[model samples]
Target: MATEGGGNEIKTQFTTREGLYKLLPHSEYSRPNRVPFNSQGSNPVRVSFVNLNDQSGNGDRLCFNVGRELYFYIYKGVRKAADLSKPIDKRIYKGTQPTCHDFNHLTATAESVSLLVGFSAGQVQLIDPIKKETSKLFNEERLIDKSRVTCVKWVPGSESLFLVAHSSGNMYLYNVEHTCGTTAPHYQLLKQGESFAVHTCKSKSTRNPLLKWTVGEGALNEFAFSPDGKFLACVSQDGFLRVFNFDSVELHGTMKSYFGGLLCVCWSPDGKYIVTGGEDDLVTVWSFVDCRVIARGHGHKSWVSVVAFDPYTTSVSVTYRFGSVGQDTQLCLWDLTEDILFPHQPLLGTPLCPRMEDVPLLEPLICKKIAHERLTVLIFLEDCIVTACQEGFICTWGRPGKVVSFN
Candidate 1:
C-alpha cells in the first residue's frame, strides 16, 4: 500500500538491503479482558511468538500470557503482519474448577500450543486453530503435571516435545507424539500426515529433581532454546548460565556468567552461539556447542534490563547485531559492520578468551544518558524496535510500520 507523499523505493543495494520499516501507534485490542492484562495494570509475565511449522495453509500466530488467563491474535501474511478485524475464533480457560495461584504461562511452535491451566495448577490445554470445535482437546484439564507453571516452551522442527522451567528450580521435558489420520479437527496427539482441521494453539514442577534439571540456587529467571531448537539455555538469580541437550534432557554445560544475576539469554539465528546479559553488566557471547565465551562486547553501566539478537538478516556468513537496554538509562547498541569482524563460524571449534588477543573486548556504539524515566522492556521486531516502561509507557522507534486491514 505504498502511496503518495515522501514515499519512495530502492532497487539493488549490497552491504545491506536497508529494508523499509516504521513504527505505528500501538492499538489496544477490543475484548482486552479476554487478553493479557494485570489488575495492578502491568503487562503479562511474557508474550510468546508461535508458529505451526507445517504452514499447510495456516501461516502463523502469536500467543500472550496474562496472569492466570490467556488471549489475543494478529494475522501474519506473506509480505506483512497485521491484526485481525474481528474475533474469528477464540477460546478462554475452559475448565470446571479454577486453580488457586494462577500464572498465564504460554509457549509453542507451528503444530500446537501448550498452556498453563487447572485446579491443581497446571499439557496444557491443546489447540488446533484450523477447524475449530471438531478438533478441540476432549479433556483439557490436568493434561500435564500440576507443578506451578513457571515457564513453558514447544520444541522446534515440528517435534512433539517441550521443556518447562518451574519455580522449584527444576525443568521438565514433555512429549507430543501420536499417529492418527488427518481427519479435520483431530485430537491433540493426532499425526502430522493425517487429514486436518488445523489452526490450533495450544507444564510444571518438582521435588527430588529426577528428570528435573536445576540451574542454580534461586528461581530460573529466563530460559530459551537454540534457534535450531536443538539446545536449551537458561538464567537464574543464582547468576549462572546453563545449557542443555534437548535430546537427552540433561545439562551439558554451565558457565558462571553474571555475578549479580542473569536477566535474559538469546540465541543467534544460526543457533551456533548465544547472547546473555544480567546484573554483572556484561554482554557475553558463548559458543552453544563449546560452551566457551566467543567474545565479551559492549554492555550497560547499570543492570542490563533486556538484550536481543537481530532477526532480520539476509547474509550467508551473517554478521551479528544486537541491542541492550539498561535500567540505568544507558543504551548499548552493537553492529558487526562497525565493530570487529566475526570469523566466529570458523573459529567456533576453538575457544577464544578475552585475553586470547584475537578477540578484543570491544566497546558498544552508544552508551549515554536518558532524559529521566527508567525503562523496563526493550524488544526488536522483524522491522521495528519497541520499548515499554514506567506509568505503562510504550514507544516504538523505527520505519513507518502499518497495519493493512482485510476486506
Candidate 2:
C-alpha cells in the first residue's frame, strides 16, 4: 500500500530496510512567532542550504521564503534544537513576494555569502544574509520579463553567472558584473529547434542578459544541472522533459510525460539517471546515457511537487534511493535496483507515446503521510532529511542513528 489509513494519519517517523528514521520535533525551524502562515495567496515555500565550512561544527545555513518574508537561519540539524529567536537575518518585502532563492556555494564563507532571491513580480536580488546587505537587484524596472520568477539558480561552479526562469516560458542568463540596458533588449536568433529557441542579446556592449531561451508551450517549471554541470535538464508545463548540452546550446534529448505536465526534475548523484515528477501523479526515471524512460513510480495520488535523490544511501552495487512529496500530503521513498536498470527482455517504447508497463513499474519502499498541507520542498543532507510544507514549517528528520538528544 502506498499509505496507511488513506494517508489521513500523519506520521512523525518511518522505517526502511536499513533502519528506522525518526523525527526531531525540537529541530523544526520557522518564523520567530511560530505561527502557521496564511498560505491562501502565497507561493510555494522553498529551502536552500550552504555550508560556511567554519571551525565551529555548525556551519550549515538555511534560507527560506514565506509570503513576503524571507529568513536566514543557522540550521542546527540533528545536533541541537533550533533557536528561532536568533535568525541571522530577516526581511519583509513591500509589493512582490519572494518566490524562490539559491545560495552560491562557490563564494560562501563565515563572514560573507551570496544569495540569489527571485520575486513574484519580475526581479532578482543578490544579497548577503550574514552582512545584512542588499548588493544588487536585476530587472528592477521589469523590462526584461514581467512574469513571476519560477526558478533561479547559480550556474554550478560560476560565482558571477546565474540563470533565471520565468512563468512566461522564458529563461534568461545574467552576469553579475554587467548591467541591464536603459531600454528593452533586442534578441538575435542563436538557434532554433522544434518547439524551442535560443537568442543572444543584441547590444553594442556587454549587458545583463547574455542570452534568452524560449522553451516549451507553458511555464518552465524547474531545471537542474547535471553532476558535472555539463548538461541541463528542464521540465515544462508542456508535459515534456528536455535535456540540453549547456555549453553547446544543443538539444541532447527529450521525453514526454505519461500524461500531464512535468513539475520538478533532478539528476542522480552519479548523473547516470534523471527523475521527474509531474501532474500525472507519478515519478518517471530516465536513463541519462540512452535518454529513455527506465521506470515509472506510482506512489502519489495527487500532483507531486518535489523529488530528490538521497545521496547518503546511493552508491555503486547498491540500490539508488530517492524520495518524493506531493499535494496528497504523502511522502514516498523509492529504491532503484539493478534489476530495473538492466531488464532481461528488450522492451519497446517510443518517446512520443509510451505505453503503460512497457518499462518497469516501481512501488515505493516506504510511504507515509508526512504533512497536513501539501509539501513544497524535500532535501537530503548528510545526517538528516529536510522537508517543508505549505504551512511554512521546515522540519528535520534524523537519519538512522544520527539523532542527538538535548531533551
Candidate 3:
C-alpha cells in the first residue's frame, strides 16, 4: 500500500515475484564485458549527496564516481518522489576523458562537483567538472607521491580550495585557480601533513603555551565536517575516531571501539552525532559534544561498506556485503527519532543461504527485492534500489514490500 499528497491512496498493481521479473526488459540485466581502462575494480568504495543550488524549491542532486566516470543525476521534479529502479533521465557525463582510474571520493559545492580518481599503478586526478570542459581551466599534473588517493572533498563554500587524503598517511590542501582564456586549472599546494599525529592540547600554566601531541599512526579511512562546518571528524584504519576543530586546526577529541577497520563515517544532519561503519559488521553512533558512544547495533553480517543519512528526516541508510557468494548484499534503514532497539530493518529480501539473517524491524517501511542472476548491489535510494546481477540485468525496485524474484 502506498499514498501521496496528504495520504491520498495510490493503487499498487499486484505482481508475483516471478511475474515482475518477466516485466523487465532483458538488456537491463546484461553485464558489460569490458571494464573501463585503468579501472582498479574498487576505487570508489562509497558515494554521497549534496545540495546542487540554494535557490528556492531546489531540492538536491546526486553525484558519484566509478572508474574515472563522475556521474551527476538531477532530480526530475520538485518535492516529488523519484523512482530509483528506473534508468536515470539525465547522465551529466558518460566518460571523463584523459582521466584514468576509478574515482574514490566525490563531493559537490555551490557551483561544481569535485572528484578524486585513482589509477591502476598509483596516481590521483583531481577532476573539476566545470573547468574540465572549458578552455580557461588548467589541468594540473597527476598527484604521484600518494600511494592511493583514498578520499577527496571540497571545503564547502570555496571554489578552488579542496582537501585530499591518501593511504600514504598524507592529507593535502590544494588551491586551484583558473585564469582568463586559459584551458587548464592552475594549482597551488597549500598544506600537507601527517593527520594521524596532530592533536589538540591545553596549556597547564598561565604563562606556558598549550602543547599538542600526536595520537595514532594509521591511514585515515573516512572524514566529514559538521553541518555547521565548525568541526571535522576523521576515522582511521586503526579504529580511532578523532574530532578536530577546523578553526584551531587541532584535534578536539577522539573515540575508539570497533575491532575492524572503519570503512565509512558520516555526521548526522543535526551535527550533534557521528555514525561510523566498519569491516567488523557493526554500526556505531557517537555523540559529538561529549565524545561518548551513543548506540551500537549489529546491522551487517559482513563488512559494512557505506552509510548515508537523510537530512530531511533523521533516517540512516547503510549497505553491507553478505559473504563470499555475493548473493546476500543488504541495505538497512534505521530511524533515529524513535530510539528503539532493532530499529534496524532490511529493505530487500533476495533468497540467500537459509542460515543468513533477513528481516527488517521497522513499521510503515518499504522493502522490495529484485531477482537478477548477478550479485552486485550498486546504489540504494529512498524510492528505488539498483542492483546488477550475473544475468546483466539492472534491476530497479520502486514500490517497497513488493517482491520480484528473477529465476
What lDDT tens digits, residue by residue, belong to model 2 across residues 91-150? 999889899999999898998899999999989999999988657899988999999999
Q: Could you arrange the candidates by lDDT from highest to lowest?
A: 2, 1, 3
Q: What is the lDDT of candidate 2?
A: 0.90
lDDT of each: 0.49, 0.90, 0.45
For residues 1-407, write the lDDT of model 1, one tens digit per residue. Answer: 88788832211111223544333344322234333233343322233344555355454444433334444455343233345354434555544322211111233444344443222244243444433433322123433233444555555654455556644555544444432122212123211221111112121222111233545677576688787667878877776777767665556676665256676788877777777787778777777766677666655667676677776641345477777766666556666542344453344123322344555565786554431334455556654455543322233445333334366
**Model 1 stretches astray by more than 4 angstroms:** 1-21, 26-44, 51-60, 76-85, 88-148, 176-210, 248-251, 297-302, 314-318, 325-332, 337-382, 385-407
- Model 3: lDDT to the true structure: 0.45
Candidate 3 per-residue lDDT, tens place, 60-139, comes to 45434444344444443212323434423222333332222222223444454554444332344555443454212122
TM-score for each candidate, following the candidate numbering = 0.60, 0.95, 0.56
